[PDB]
């Protein structure tokens, strides 16, 4: 499992 970048959840 890879961790998402700090902004991966931003539109």
């Amino acid at each position, epitope marked *: 499992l890879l*961790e998402l*970048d700090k902004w991966a959840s931003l539109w």
Partner: antibody
Amino acid sequence: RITLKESGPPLVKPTQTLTLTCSFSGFSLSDFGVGVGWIRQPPGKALEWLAIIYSDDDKRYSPSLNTRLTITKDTSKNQVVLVMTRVSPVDTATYFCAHRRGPTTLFGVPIARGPVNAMDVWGQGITVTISS
Amino acid sequence: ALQLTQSPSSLSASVGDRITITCRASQGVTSALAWYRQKPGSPPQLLIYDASSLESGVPSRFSGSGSGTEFTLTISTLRPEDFATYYCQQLHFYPHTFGGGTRVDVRR
């Protein structure tokens, strides 16, 4: 307008601690979501991501080097430091620091991710050799 | 870590040529992909950010495309200062990773 410069020792002995400093101008680590990262390039090889720290003190390290790396910042001095412990000749490389934009903000509000997907300004780079 | 595969690893071309480099990701990274140009003895220079956005100040001859797992960088008209090494980088997952690079030399 943005300039970054790496400083540190050009030669270090195996098992020692390497401390690299990134001094910059043109931006503030107080800028919302801004990041300063470190990337190394060993002789004749590709770029290798090392770590990144953000305006909010959030930080990440390459998982395979996480036990030997520590990244810090001093927002009042426009500097970011990368410390690497127990170095070995495998660590010989040219080290670069680089700026990462925070997201587009409108009157303070973060409205777009786009700009953060890249390291837009890199320092000149410092070549560090590890040998006894 | 997320794997990026650049291709070709090496390419020979001539001034005025049109070249295209691709980068394939082991999995989707949405549009979080950047392209850089690196001249010998110099640091990387940003060309494209967020997969297809042209970095301010970069010549119009550079363009990028893709989203998900396939990406391409295109140089409409090769210029002398363009013979160098290019790298892709994904910033969707930690650790951020770079492709192996693509060197472009003067052909003969």
